[PDB]
Ligand binder design. Sequence first.
Ligand SMILES: Nc1nc2c(ncn2[C@@H]2O[C@H](COP(=O)(O)OP(=O)(O)O)[C@@H](OP(=O)(O)OP(=O)(O)O)[C@H]2O)c(=O)[nH]1
Ligand SMILES: Nc1nc2c(ncn2[C@@H]2O[C@H](COP(=O)(O)OP(=O)(O)O)[C@@H](OP(=O)(O)OP(=O)(O)O)[C@H]2O)c(=O)[nH]1
Ligand SMILES: Nc1nc2c(ncn2[C@@H]2O[C@H](COP(=O)(O)OP(=O)(O)O)[C@@H](OP(=O)(O)OP(=O)(O)O)[C@H]2O)c(=O)[nH]1
Ligand SMILES: Nc1nc2c(ncn2[C@@H]2O[C@H](COP(=O)(O)OP(=O)(O)O)[C@@H](OP(=O)(O)OP(=O)(O)O)[C@H]2O)c(=O)[nH]1
Ligand SMILES: [Mg+2]
Ligand SMILES: [Mg+2]
Ligand SMILES: [Mg+2]
Ligand SMILES: [Mg+2]
Lengths: 180, 180, 180, 180
Amino acid sequence: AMMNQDIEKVLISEEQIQEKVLELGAIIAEDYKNTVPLAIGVLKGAMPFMADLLKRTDTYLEMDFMAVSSYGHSTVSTGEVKILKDLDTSVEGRDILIVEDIIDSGLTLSYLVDLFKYRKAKSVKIVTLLDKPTGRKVDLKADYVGFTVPHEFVVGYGLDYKEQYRNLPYVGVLKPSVYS
Amino acid sequence: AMMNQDIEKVLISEEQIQEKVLELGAIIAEDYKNTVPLAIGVLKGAMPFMADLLKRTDTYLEMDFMAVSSYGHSTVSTGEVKILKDLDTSVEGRDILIVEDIIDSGLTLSYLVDLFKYRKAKSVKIVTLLDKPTGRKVDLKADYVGFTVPHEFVVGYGLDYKEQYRNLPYVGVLKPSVYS
Amino acid sequence: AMMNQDIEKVLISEEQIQEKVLELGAIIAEDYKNTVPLAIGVLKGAMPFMADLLKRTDTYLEMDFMAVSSYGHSTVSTGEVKILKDLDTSVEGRDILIVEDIIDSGLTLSYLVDLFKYRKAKSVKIVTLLDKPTGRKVDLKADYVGFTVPHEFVVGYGLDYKEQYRNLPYVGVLKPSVYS
Amino acid sequence: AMMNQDIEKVLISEEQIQEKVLELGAIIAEDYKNTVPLAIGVLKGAMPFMADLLKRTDTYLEMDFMAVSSYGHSTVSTGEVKILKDLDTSVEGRDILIVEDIIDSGLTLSYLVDLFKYRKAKSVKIVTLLDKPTGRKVDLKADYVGFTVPHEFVVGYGLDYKEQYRNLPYVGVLKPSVYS
Ligand SMILES: Nc1nc2c(ncn2[C@@H]2O[C@H](COP(=O)(O)OP(=O)(O)O)[C@@H](OP(=O)(O)OP(=O)(O)O)[C@H]2O)c(=O)[nH]1
Ligand SMILES: Nc1nc2c(ncn2[C@@H]2O[C@H](COP(=O)(O)OP(=O)(O)O)[C@@H](OP(=O)(O)OP(=O)(O)O)[C@H]2O)c(=O)[nH]1
Ligand SMILES: Nc1nc2c(ncn2[C@@H]2O[C@H](COP(=O)(O)OP(=O)(O)O)[C@@H](OP(=O)(O)OP(=O)(O)O)[C@H]2O)c(=O)[nH]1
Ligand SMILES: Nc1nc2c(ncn2[C@@H]2O[C@H](COP(=O)(O)OP(=O)(O)O)[C@@H](OP(=O)(O)OP(=O)(O)O)[C@H]2O)c(=O)[nH]1
Ligand SMILES: [Mg+2]
Ligand SMILES: [Mg+2]
Ligand SMILES: [Mg+2]
Ligand SMILES: [Mg+2]
């Protein structure tokens, strides 16, 4: 019983992830050299990428995190979600950088973006490791993108199937037999 | 030995409060007869008034509550507050009735008002037991008001000094010897 | 369309509730005359009763509130729940009084009781408006009880059916046709 | 202009951290091969270490997180803290692995340890990257330790001074001129 045996194929190895993280980190450090931004991750999936990205971003910055959950029907259509943990600091006047593992529908993330704008953020940018424009249900594009990927359910490096596989150091596609 | 000894004068007796609450309840019941509104109280102070008001509001309605805290000096400027407990249901398409004990500066309350408007509320109205408009730091008008009271620090019927005196059935003014 | 028309029969009218609230309040005020207890309500159902009870409790006290939600299978068997809003003050050394609308299974409430004991409460007592020893799934008895009632689903005065009827000023039994 | 100029000395380089993390990950993967543990990080500081550790832990596991804050002077005594974000799943019957960046006083961590034991955890173990046992205000031993470090205030790899320097890929000591 080993996780590797559940993966049909690899999409992005650890080597390529760390390479792209090094690239995005250096770009972000230069873009944010004249401000102390508030970098925000949405639990749970964004944590591994956010960890590796920010330690390749050589500039002063603060971290924070938010936890949200679905309301049921309203979340599936407008992205409105229940805030379980709000930010530990105010958004007003801050340059916000949202760090995400993947953008698929974009519903929830667009709700948070405009929420931070309602809270009078100085700016709101997005950096995502993976982008799936296929399943997009609102006009939302990330400012920084590590990889664009097909509409195929992947796992690893923060992305789960029923709360497991988040700890893989790579991203891959599960064998169809894994699903249940 | 007893709280009444700390009270210098009674500003609004229990009898007066229940008379106006009976009045407000009937008005609100008429205004919301063709909708199932979401009646929201902001902890902790609004709890006694919200309880007695909806007891007098003979119409179908749901209850919910929110808890917030300040970000320090940031809240004092725009009223932005940390959400500790969001609503249990979505705001979109709902008629929101915010139940408050008192509106003084209005900073925090206006922030929640436009938060719910950002969340696509069908309508957002405010009913407060006490209105202290002389303290406003923002333009915010309550739609339903029990009493308008002078620019003074009161206590009782939800309103606390250092977390005490909320359980008084009336609204009064403390003797200056109490402040420390 | 009026709520009264949905009630098959009344269990406790408003007059009897306020009478019992006056009785329990005076008992609690004497028992807690030599301490400033922390009175805690569990949202949402306990709010109306907690409001009326504490304003008939003529002694110094503090209020607080907690919000919890179910985990699924673990909540149905052991009462363990997710804390959505924790207390705003520490429990250590405090005399805790939990104010509840009804005790049926007792699972959740016994989890919170022993949680406060784990947090080194000086004492943990319970006051409940209604008690249904029928559906009890753990040995838990309230210290103060307003009314013992049969194993029949009631509504009003904080108790809901699908989030409605909480605002009734009395407790009654819905007509069977109301259910869906 | 750059953070490295604020650092007086590097205590544990990035290369050393990843070597030990690789070691810890393999050990933990062996110890948890016959269970699906719940790996819990305490925000914010544990995020970088937790990310790299589970990347090296080739076994099935779930991730979760908690957020807390202090009650003022009360936390300093028994470590009791306000829960801002509880776990997303129940603790009962689960093998809990708490992932920490550093253990200094141990007050807060011991409180969470016995909280999870109160919630009927099957087991509760602790892995910390850094151990500062000379600062203990309670008897708490970590089961897995990366490095033991002297009684000194460090920064980097999750550890902050006034919310900054978390994003350093190493652990260092600030120049005294930085403290204000
Ligand atoms: N494993 C995996 N997950 C995907 C994929 N695409 C989207 N998700 C996740 O599914 C959840 C719901 O996503 P959607 O709302 O449909 O799309 P969105 O990501 O654009 O919002 C999100 O987080 P969540 O799962 O609700 O939270 P968490 O897992 O981040 O804690 C998202 O991260 C994928 O290809 N693989
Ligand atoms: N006792 C008392 N309180 C007043 C009075 N006027 C305002 N407050 C309360 O003080 C807190 C902050 O007041 P302001 O910022 O000045 O006014 P605002 O609430 O309208 O913004 C609010 O709640 P809070 O105290 O932060 O929350 P909670 O106590 O409801 O939990 C508000 O309800 C008064 O005359 N007497
Ligand atoms: N209307 C009504 N409700 C009852 C009755 N008996 C129990 N409940 C409610 O159902 C929910 C689950 O109760 P149980 O866990 O089965 O029993 P317990 O009350 O002893 O814990 C509780 O709150 P909750 O509904 O989950 O939260 P909230 O409604 O207090 O927000 C409780 O208040 C009843 O006769 N009538
Ligand atoms: N930078 C740094 N921090 C240390 C050091 N030792 C302890 N801390 C952090 O300070 C906070 C309180 O520390 P103590 O109460 O003294 O030690 P304890 O965490 O073991 O109880 C904790 O997290 P926190 O800061 O309150 O939370 P967060 O920063 O993880 O969000 C802890 O992680 C150190 O040498 N350097
Ligand atoms: Mg997931
Ligand atoms: Mg107050
Ligand atoms: Mg209910
Ligand atoms: Mg810190």
